Design a protein around this motif. Structure first.
Motif, PDB file in Angstrom:
ATOM      1  N   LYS A   7     -10.639   0.759  -2.161  1.00  0.00           N
ATOM      2  CA  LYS A   7     -10.582   0.071  -2.875  1.00  0.00           C
ATOM      3  C   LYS A   7     -12.101  -0.501  -3.485  1.00  0.00           C
ATOM      4  O   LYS A   7     -12.800   0.015  -2.272  1.00  0.00           O
ATOM      5  N   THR A  17      -7.102  -1.104   4.680  1.00  0.00           N
ATOM      6  CA  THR A  17      -6.499  -1.189   3.360  1.00  0.00           C
ATOM      7  C   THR A  17      -7.870  -1.191   2.269  1.00  0.00           C
ATOM      8  O   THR A  17      -7.512  -0.299   1.280  1.00  0.00           O
ATOM      9  N   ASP A  77       0.910  -1.315  -0.219  1.00  0.00           N
ATOM     10  CA  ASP A  77       0.432  -0.002   0.156  1.00  0.00           C
ATOM     11  C   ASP A  77       0.749   1.257  -0.068  1.00  0.00           C
ATOM     12  O   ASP A  77       2.191   1.045  -0.376  1.00  0.00           O
TER      13      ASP A  77
HETATM   14 MG   LIG Z   1      -4.052   1.990   0.131  1.00  0.00          MG
END
Ligand SMILES: [Mg+2]
Ligand SMILES: Nc1ncnc2c1ncn2[C@@H]1O[C@H](COP(=O)(O)OP(=O)(O)O)[C@@H](O)[C@H]1O
Ligand SMILES: Nc1ncnc2c1ncn2[C@@H]1O[C@H](COP(=O)(O)OP(=O)(O)O)[C@@H](O)[C@H]1O
Ligand SMILES: Nc1ncnc2c1ncn2[C@@H]1O[C@H](COP(=O)(O)OP(=O)(O)O)[C@@H](O)[C@H]1O
Ligand SMILES: [Mg+2]
Ligand SMILES: [Mg+2]
Ligand SMILES: [Mg+2]
Lengths: 75, 104, 525, 72, 156, 77, 106, 151
Positions: free
Chosen positions: C169, C165, C96
């Motif tokens: 997305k 994370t 990331d």
């Molecule tokens: Mg990320």
């Protein structure tokens, strides 16, 4: 809007086009039907000559582009 | 039923669900079309009959109108409509989360 | 004078050069363009991009990963190339932070352009940025919290990190399910860091919520014609032998006889050798046999007559994963059956996924290898889901390796900026201005994160700055409603390694780009 | 154009117009604090609005009536 | 509240409108090939190959569409064919209609994130409704199998 | 001053010029109103309604709106 | 309709004669069954003219105002003296305004 | 949709169109370029410029005057044309201030670009600038000193 790299025909236009192609194929061999029919005389653009009355031979020797006319030829 | 559910909601989500239902009405209109029927009247009659409780009322092309279709033997498995709805919704959600195009 | 602006010309045709002002202008323009392009795909409310290839195949790619966006773009600006390589190296190091580091570098270079316009020598800017980077790194290290000792707390931290994370997305729709999947997949590695032990299988069709982590393992290979399609209490032997027209490795050897009967005898001897090799393999007492290479028809029927599964052409990754998941040893000689360990699993069968058939290993012994089946509505959805899952797995593996965590949602950036401002307030000269610009970029990161959601970024950033100055060191952006909140309670955490790498790489790239005062291009080929 | 949310503002103004009979309630473009255009002195000629509606309707009627294009 | 955030970009809106227009054009293209009274399309590729078909997936994949939204719709039809095998035209028309409604939804001033969540809620409710209308069937009943096959073949 | 080539765009230009000549104000409202009318007519046409019927309904609604405008109008000195 | 009969080689003169006979019969039938009013009533004549104008106008874009435009047309034509010359009816086109704003000047 | 980014093309060949992003970008770039070009010729320590004509005459002239610098340049950016016309009108009204007004306008437009980047509606910027202009004009008028009485 469709963004298809080609030509599109829709509705009565394509129907009439297909019918015209089939009619042209029929008109090519319509004069060789029946005892009072007469033969044709094909030239193969190199001097080769073919004299025939058979519909299959005439349609096979000709080079055809339209899909419906083809359909009639393989028919 | 999704129009009713949208009426049970409030805010922008109610408008979005209303648009969802009005978009689901497209396929019945297309079925009424292509068969010589009047799409608006046929779709309105579908909606009215389904509101009356006729769950199996559908477009009858054999008689050129509306009737029960379970007597017309017009059925498809559930995992056709369910799959189509789920996949279309997922694809629309994926497309909505796009804001730029880059030429590689 | 200068090479370009001289009465005599010193270059070949097509080769030019750009002096101080022009080189700085071009570098800053390229960096700002890269930063603007990569941003707006940042934070929980960032959109995706469409990468339409101009090549012959015209590959279509819908992605949110900044590294992939910067990878597949035709870039001619050299500073843009520097930033692209930064993003690629950041992706290689950790999964990331590519967009974060690229945006931070772009903002730093924008501040550098402003400072240069304010008549400040770039070396002063570089020195001030070095001092500010030291201060920010010290503050971030002092802010780290470790929870690796406690099992339950570490598991909770892993779940929080995976959710953070995956928030940006496409998987944010099923964040909970995908976070549980990723955490379980990483935990099944038993501390090993090889992500190659985790296989992601993309099968078209089905909802994105239909994706699952298989309890055993899945193989996309086939089985011999006359072999069982289902065995129980499998004893698996994994091998790397030929068993395909197996020739003795004496390359100069040949058959030289004076009659066809001798040729037939030699052919029968070759078949007998193959049969003896198959018998030696069977002496291990096995039920299923997996070979890395091809298996020809004669050994195929030899295995079939013995009722032994013979899976062929399982590549190096395949045999490695099978050894990891079942515990077997990849063997190439079979003269010592007692020196070879056989993998064991409860059930081997064929499953029906989509329109394809796969071999399913159930009840595996070791299980230190996972397969993840991804179901999607489009190929682009499957590719983006695979990329997002890869990012989550990389970050989780890094957290497993180093358990130190820091709070996200701009909290780390605000704390770094506060430390940098505190350092700059007690420094004379224009280096104080340089550190102030450093802090401005660090604050601009959460400012862009807030802008992407449509909130009042200026007000939120002011509130966060005031809270951090007062003493609230865990304050951060709350994107459920658009206010500030406690990142510890709200469970937004990031790996300390990722943030440290982002900060250091961005500072390094800004420093190396700022030092350039002349760009010289050779004649293009 | 004024930065307000279009659908929410229009729905609120329409609901206010329906509830209390007052055809003078409009959009507070300048953020003067009130939705009533009478006090805000936003005045338009009736002839202008009638001409707008009429001309738009006739042009739309023509555009709908056209079904072929024969550009060279 | 006040003026609120100012949309400086205006380019994401253009991209959204272009994607929706492409999807709607694809649906209108394959809109006349639906139902027992639909008709087939003839597609000629770069070579002389000719395909006459009513299958939505075949029509979509046989013609190059050159637009990312159209290509994603083609992939959608392929996925529906993989999971179901029929209804490949209905799913594409549904997606096109959904995006067409999204046009007015976005024009009304709704962020394209509330729309996605509302669509997810509507999809869940619709799945519930479709399951409610469903009727249990067993493979021993040959009449239902024959009726399903005949309904599938009605449009070809 | 806009260099258009599409004939419908020229019709829009002439509509704006007509509004300017007749009134002098509202030359921007007419274009927006016509665009909205045609945008709604698009989704009406998609549902299988003859465009002539859409035009007739638009004329009826325009008559109703004009009557309402006359009703709610106010006089000034 | 006569293309198929042409295609079997029917003599074109036969088709021409058939068309001529059919046209003569149709014209005679039209003259026979056409409705005429032999009362010379001014009000009835005006109503007939207005109805004919409405029918001739109910296919154009001004069909919504067809009655009003037909009344204008009848009034304009009735004021021509004896030759009904077209050049004695002015047609002025002024941009701006609705169709209902159009007027006939006496 | 957009006039230019639509499946159907509504323009003649060669006609163009730039929406909010492109229009603001081009306007700001042109204005800032004009301001940077005319600046550095400002103040007691300002320097001069060489204007080389590309025509047949190839007229040569060196000048410190902002108005003459802005007049004799081929300008395609419309905002740059706006600023050039501003400088010419300023020269017509009074003899000096041609460079100062152009630099002030360029700096104002740069600040406007920054404010737009900060997600501020340009109408709010315009209103704030109107208030600021009123206040600044009032202050400057209050600061004025008149000595027309004593010779
Ligand atoms: Mg990320
Ligand atoms: N739920 C959340 N709340 C607040 N901030 C978040 C959340 N999820 C992610 N972020 C922030 O978004 C930033 C960018 O993350 P992301 O876009 O997923 O990857 P990258 O770091 O490569 O840009 C991170 O710095 C993180 O602080
Ligand atoms: N005999 C019928 N009467 C009414 N509707 C039908 C009949 N047969 C099929 N349909 C409908 O036509 C729709 C479209 O099916 P089809 O044209 O085969 O394409 P697809 O299978 O891709 O949806 C189906 O949803 C079905 O409900
Ligand atoms: N002796 C001076 N001391 C300080 N400032 C000066 C002096 N002379 C001129 N200036 C400043 O230089 C600025 C620019 O003036 P100049 O370059 O002559 O043309 P313009 O007024 O058109 O820009 C003026 O605003 C003025 O305030
Ligand atoms: Mg079907
Ligand atoms: Mg006005
Ligand atoms: Mg001066």
């Amino acid at each position: 809007p469709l963004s298809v790299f080609g030509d599109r025909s829709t509705g009565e236009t394509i129907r009439s086009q297909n019918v015209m192609a089939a009619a042209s194929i029929a008109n090519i061999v319509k004069s060789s039907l029946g005892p009072v029919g007469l033969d044709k005389m094909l030239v193969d653009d190199i001097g080769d000559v073919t004299i025939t009355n058979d519909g299959a031979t005439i349609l096979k020797l000709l080079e055809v582009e339209h899909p419906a006319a083809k359909v009639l030829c393989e028919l | 039923r999704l129009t009713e559910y949208s009426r049970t909601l409030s805010g922008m989500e109610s408008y979005c669900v209303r648009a969802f239902a009005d978009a689901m009405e497209v396929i019945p209109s297309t079925l009424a079309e292509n068969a010589g029927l009047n799409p608006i009247s046929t779709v309105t009659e579908l909606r009215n009959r389904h509101a009356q409780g006729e769950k199996t009322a559908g477009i009858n092309v054999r008689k050129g109108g509306i009737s029960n279709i379970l007597e017309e033997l017009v059925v498809q498995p559930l995992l056709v409509s369910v799959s189509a709805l789920t996949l279309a919704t997922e694809t629309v959600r994926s497309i909505l989360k796009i804001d730029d195009v880059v030429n590689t | 004078a200068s090479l370009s602006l001289a009465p005599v010309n010193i270059f070949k045709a097509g080769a030019d050069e750009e002096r101080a002002e022009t080189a700085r202008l071009t570098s800053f323009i390229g960096a700002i363009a890269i930063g603007d392009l990569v941003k707006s795909t940042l934070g929980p409310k960032g959109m995706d991009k469409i990468l339409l290839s101009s090549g012959r195949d015209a590959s279509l790619m819908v992605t949110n990963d900044g590294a992939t966006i910067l990878k597949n773009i035709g870039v001619d600006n050299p500073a843009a190339k520097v930033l692209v390589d930064m993003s690629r190296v950041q992706d290689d190091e950790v999964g990331d932070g590519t967009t974060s580091v690229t945006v931070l570098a772009a903002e730093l270079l924008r501040e550098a352009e402003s400072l240069i316009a304010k008549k400040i020598h770039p070396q002063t800017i570089i020195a001030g940025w070095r001092e500010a980077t030291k201060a920010a790194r010290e503050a971030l290290l002092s802010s780290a919290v470790d929870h690796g000792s406690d099992e339950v707390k570490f598991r909770q931290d892993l779940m929080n990190i995976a959710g953070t994370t995956l928030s940006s997305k496409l998987l944010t729709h099923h964040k909970d399910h995908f976070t549980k999947l990723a955490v379980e997949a990483v935990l099944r590695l038993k501390g090993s860091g090889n992500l190659e032990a985790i296989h992601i299988i993309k099968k078209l069709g089905g909802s994105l919520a239909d994706s699952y982590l298989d309890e055993g393992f899945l193989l996309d290979k086939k089985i011999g014609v006359n072999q069982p399609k289902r065995i129980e209490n499998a004893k698996i032997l994994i091998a790397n032998t030929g068993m395909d027209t197996d020739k003795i490795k004496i390359f100069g050897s040949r058959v030289r006889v004076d009659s066809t009967a001798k040729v037939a005898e030699i052919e029968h001897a070759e078949k007998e050798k193959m049969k003896e090799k198959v018998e030696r393999i069977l002496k291990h007492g096995i039920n299923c046999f997996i070979n890395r290479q091809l298996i020809y028809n004669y050994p195929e029927q030899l295995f079939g007559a013995a009722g032994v599964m013979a899976i062929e052409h399982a590549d190096f990754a395949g045999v490695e994963r099978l050894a990891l998941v079942t515990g077997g040893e990849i063997a190439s000689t079979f003269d010592h059956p007692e020196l070879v360990k056989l993998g064991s699993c409860k059930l081997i069968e064929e499953v029906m996924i989509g329109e394809d058939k796969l071999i399913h290993f159930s009840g595996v012994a070791l299980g230190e290898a996972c397969t993840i089946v991804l179901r999607g509505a489009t190929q682009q959805i499957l590719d983006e889901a695979e990329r997002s899952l890869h990012d989550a797995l990389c970050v989780l593996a890094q957290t497993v390796k180093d358990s130190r965590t820091v709070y996200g949602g701009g909290c780390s950036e605000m704390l770094m900026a506060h430390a940098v401002t505190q350092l700059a307030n007690r420094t004379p000269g224009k280096e104080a201005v340089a550190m102030e610009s450093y802090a401005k970029a660090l604050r601009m990161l959460p400012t862009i994160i807030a802008d992407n959601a449509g909130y009042d970024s200026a007000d939120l950033v002011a509130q966060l700055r005031a809270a951090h100055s007062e003493g609230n060191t865990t304050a951060g952006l709350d994107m459920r409603e658009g206010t500030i909140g406690d990142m510890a309670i709200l469970g937004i955490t990031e790996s300390f390694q990722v943030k440290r790498q982002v900060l250091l790489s961005a500072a390094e790239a800004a420093e190396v780009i700022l030092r350039v005062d002349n760009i010289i291009k050779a004649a293009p080929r | 154009n004024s930065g307000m949310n279009p659908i929410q503002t229009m729905t609120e103004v329409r609901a206010r117009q329906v509830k209390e009979m007052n055809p003078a309630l409009g959009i507070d473009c300048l953020h003067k604090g009130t939705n009533d255009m009478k006090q805000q002195h936003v005045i338009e000629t009736l002839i202008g609005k009638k001409q707008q509606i009429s001309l738009a309707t006739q042009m739309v009627r023509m555009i709908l009536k056209i079904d072929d294009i024969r550009k060279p | 509240r006040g003026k609120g955030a100012y949309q400086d970009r205006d380019k994401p809106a253009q991209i959204r409108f272009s994607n929706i227009s492409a999807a709607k054009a694809v649906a209108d293209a394959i809109r006349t090939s639906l139902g027992p009274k639909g008709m087939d399309k003839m597609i000629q590729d770069g070579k002389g190959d000719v395909t006459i078909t009513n299958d939505g997936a075949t029509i979509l994949k046989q013609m190059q569409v050159l637009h990312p939204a159209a290509r994603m719709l083609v992939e959608l039809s392929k996925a529906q064919d993989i999971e179901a095998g029929d209804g490949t035209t209905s799913v594409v028309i549904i997606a096109g209609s959904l995006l067409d409604s999204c046009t007015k939804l976005l024009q009304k001033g709704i962020h394209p994130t509330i729309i996605s969540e509302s669509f997810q809620k509507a999809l869940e409710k619709g799945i519930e409704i479709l399951t409610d209308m469903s009727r249990p069937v067993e493979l021993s009943d040959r009449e239902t199998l024959l009726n399903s096959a005949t309904t599938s073949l009605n449009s070809k | 001053m806009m260099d258009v080539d599409h004939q419908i765009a020229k019709l829009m230009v002439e509509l704006s010029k007509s509004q300017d000549d007749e009134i002098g104000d509202g030359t921007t409202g007419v274009v927006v109103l016509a665009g909205a009318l045609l945008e709604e007519a698009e989704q009406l046409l998609d549902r299988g309604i003859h465009p002539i019927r859409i035009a007739d309904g638009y004329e009826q609604a325009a008559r109703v709106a004009i009557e309402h405008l006359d009703k709610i109008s106010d006089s000034v000195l | 309709q006569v293309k198929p009969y042409v295609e079997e080689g029917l003599h074109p003169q036969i088709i021409i004669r058939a068309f001529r006979t059919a046209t003569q019969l149709a014209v005679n039938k039209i003259k026979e069954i056409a409705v005429t009013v032999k009362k010379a009533d001014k009000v009835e004549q005006r109503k007939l003219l207005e109805k004919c104008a409405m029918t001739a106008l109910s296919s154009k874009l001004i069909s919504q105002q067809k009655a009003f435009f037909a009344k204008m047309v009848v009034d304009a034509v009735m004021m021509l003296d004896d030759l009904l010359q077209l050049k004695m009816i002015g047609i002025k086109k002024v941009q701006g305004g609705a169709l209902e704003d159009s007027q006939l000047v006496a």
